[PDB]
Amino acid sequence: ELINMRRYRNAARKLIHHYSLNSTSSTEYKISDVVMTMIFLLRSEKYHSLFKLLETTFDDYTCRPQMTQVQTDTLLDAVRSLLEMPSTTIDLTTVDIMRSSFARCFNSPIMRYAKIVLLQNVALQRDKRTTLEELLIERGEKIQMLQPQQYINSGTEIPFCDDAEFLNRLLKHIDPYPLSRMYYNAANTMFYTTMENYAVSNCKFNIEDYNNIFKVMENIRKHSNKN
Amino acid sequence: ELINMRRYRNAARKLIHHYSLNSTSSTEYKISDVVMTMIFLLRSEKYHSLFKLLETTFDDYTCRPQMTQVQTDTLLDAVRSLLEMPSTTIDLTTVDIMRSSFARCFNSPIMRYAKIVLLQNVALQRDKRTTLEELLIERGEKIQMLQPQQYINSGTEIPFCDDAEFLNRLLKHIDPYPLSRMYYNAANTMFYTTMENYAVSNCKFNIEDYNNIFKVMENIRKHSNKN
Amino acid sequence: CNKVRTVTEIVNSDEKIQKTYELAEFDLKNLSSLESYETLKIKLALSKYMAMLSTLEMTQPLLEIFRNKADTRQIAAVVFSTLAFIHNRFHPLVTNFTNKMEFVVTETNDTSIPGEPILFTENEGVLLCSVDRPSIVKMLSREFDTEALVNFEDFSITEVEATQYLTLLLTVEHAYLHYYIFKNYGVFEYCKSLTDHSLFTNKLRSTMSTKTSNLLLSKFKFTIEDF
Amino acid sequence: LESYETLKIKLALSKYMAMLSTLEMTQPLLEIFRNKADTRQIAAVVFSTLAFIHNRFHPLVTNFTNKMEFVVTETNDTSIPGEPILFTENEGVLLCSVDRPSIVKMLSREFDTEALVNFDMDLSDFSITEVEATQYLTLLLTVEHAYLHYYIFKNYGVFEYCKSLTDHSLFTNKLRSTMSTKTSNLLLSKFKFTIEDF
């Protein structure tokens, strides 16, 4: 039809890859991009589950659809098919993350140049806001309960390969590998997974300071006023 | 049936009013209004022409579509139908102005989950042998970038505490201090600083030749070869 | 050359303070300051880690190793060996783990700790190394982008594959920082670092206790995109 | 002749110290340059030293015939390797840019103190140290290099000034004792000094 299936399918693929915390690369977004994504979701009956979930989430979060296991499983399979990735990597966690992301995006006035804000806040667990330290101590109690799984006493000496030929061949194989991009990907992935953990466990965290404190403190004492 | 046309059309009425009377008003509206308007427009067969027209308004705003007068006539009919406003103040020019308003609104950036900005410093190590003049010009381009701060341009006679007592006390106090040691220290410090800078910048500096030119040429042609 | 000879002479006299130096400092600053040398160092450390893993009697690739929910023996050994590698890198004179460690590997929500996927504790003289399978598999399932976005500002190894090993290396870096802080001081200090991380400025100065070492992240400085 | 010229040299150094005291800067020179925040005092020192060199070189003209500005940079990328005093004219006004880190390196380089050549009254007074005198001498010589380049720039075009920046052999065209360029011991002609490189 007048809608380009390929264009809108790929645009929706990008939007889900990003707003569902599954991808790393960031592409600057426009409103028409999300409009095309949602239109493509509309045109496909199979993804009408997410499409109508978005429709419900347009107005407010005083309600959430009530579904059985069958609808959820079919929705999960549809999302897996859209992502074309390993299937079990998303689950209701990713579903709720995407819902909260899209709900936050749909609300709020249109800004001149982006907003650049995390979505951990007011995302999950409408119940309360519990202290992080108490969660640490309580969950550590359950961690230290039972079943340590390995008793390694003597310790095995670390294996070392002094054959430079293999080290040089590995080095040659890392020749095409750019350190900057790889490191950027690794840091971004670690940070996003930590943010997911903070969101899911509902332990509020110093978004702008604590991790920034890690970085700043470590770099500063690595270079300046080491003494 | 699954789609509420009434609310979609009601929001679209205000949105089209604002965007057709050239009242942008980004404060009033969000993405939800735009997407509801787009869905309602795509819903009926009547506005498929307008949907096709706005398709290329998403990204390529320099390509003027080629259309005849009859197609524009039917499009004007659709515009009068949607606006529900008399065609006295409605024409193709206002339609195109509204089109530009929609394109500008569509291309607005919205929000991101932020990103670990791994750009920072690299120290710009060329990893090759480097010349003198190329480094001088390339560095001087960044030297003259911005921020002129110190503004001392008046022009004044140099202040002098012309009293000899201050001079005499100092001059008597400098008697035990040799000149050879001081001049050695100054020259040695200059040599160390220059070699440090060349080591940092990895510039091909004459091992012991340019500063030798300084020394010998200056001293000798001061002493002789006066001209 | 092997010698750089410096002299400061004198008018109407012949005595000179003739000093001779060496190229060790100049060339050493050139090479260490050169980014190629530090890139070589980073690639060498990564190659040593890869050779360690290959000689670890592990033929299955990393993510495939972490997919095995049934046996956590391989995952525990991987974490153990990476801890051993970092312990080597800080203090080369020590290789083995003199204390016998036990791994409590979990796949539950409660045991997951938001910020330290591998928490390390002690319980009546026996050392506890928490392994959080859900968080680490979430980390290793983010489909790193590989297109050329450098933004400078024979083997079955690719970009994203070695990227996962690098991410694991950074995770073990944080874990080992916490472990070393715990071992140098009391449990209160370790937990307070887990809550503030301020002890990074206490003992890790480049001295006998801690002898420099890159820590990897010193190669690339990274910041948040805050306002 | 050595006694006379030594007296003249120490008199010139005393005048240098006296002028830099007349600048009325409460901060010490080493702390003058350590302070990355305030460029006002450092640029004042540079401007006053340029005035000192200009007037010693040209006693007959006193008032400035030029207007000058200063830009202070504290990064590796800006630092020209060898001439931390970046002096040029931009849009009808001369600019004397400075690389502070190079200078704070220079004035903190474990100055030699031992004489390796091997050969009522008193009370509180103006006391000086060998390190401070050596630092002042190094600063004066550096700004003298800057003023040599400025004079080449004035007496030539910017093209020839740049070619001098490439060669430095062009100092000897005009700086001799003349009715225009008034002689002067120049604070470095007092001693010859050569390298013994292989």
Author numbering:
A (entry chain L), B (entry chain K): 112 to 338
C (entry chain M): 6 to 158, 198 to 271
D (entry chain N): 39 to 157, 193 to 271
Manuscript excerpt for this entry:
Unique to the base, the plug occupies the innermost position and essentially seals one end of the capsid. In the base there is a “plug” that sits in the center-most portion sealing of the nucleocapsid; further analyses revealed that the plug density has C7 symmetry. Like the inner layer, each asymmetric unit of the plug is primarily composed of two copies of AC101 (AC101-3 and AC101-4) and two copies of AC144 (AC144-3 and AC144-4), though they arranged with C7 symmetry rather than C14 symmetry found in the inner layer. The interactions among the AC101 dimers, as well as between AC101 and AC144, are almost identical to those described in the inner layer. However, the long helix (Glu27-Leu61) of AC144-3 is bent near residue Leu39, resulting in the long helix being broken into two helices: helix 1 (Ala29-Ser38) and helix 2 (Leu39-Thr60), and helix 2 is rotated ~60° compared to that of AC144-1, allowing the N-terminal β-sheet to interact with AC101-3 and AC144-4 in the same manner seen in the inner layer, and thus anchoring AC101-3 to AC144-4. The rotation of helix 2 forces AC144-4 to rotate and point toward the C7 axis, effectively sealing the base domain. Interactions between the inner layer and the plug, primarily through several hydrogen bonds, take place at the interface between AC101-1 in the inner layer and AC144-3 in plug. These interactions allow two neighboring AC101 dimers in the inner layer to “clamp” one AC101-AC144 complex in the plug. Hence, the AC101 dimers in the inner layer link both the outer shell and plug together, and thus stabilize the base.
Baculovirus Autographa californica multiple nucleopolyhedrovirus (AcMNPV) has been widely used as a bioinsecticide and a protein expression vector. The DNA genome, along with the baculovirus basic DNA-binding protein P6.9 protein, is encapsulated by an enveloped, rod-shaped nucleocapsid; the major capsid protein VP39 and some additional minor proteins are known to comprise the nucleocapsid. Here, we show a 3.2 Å resolution structure of helical cylindrical body of the AcMNPV nucleocapsid, composed of VP39, as well as 4.3 Å resolution structures of both the head and the base of the nucleocapsid composed of over 100 protein subunits. Surprisingly, the C14 symmetric base had nearly identical features to that of the apical head, except for that in the central regions. Both the head and base could be further segmented into three parts: an outer shell, an inner layer and a central region.
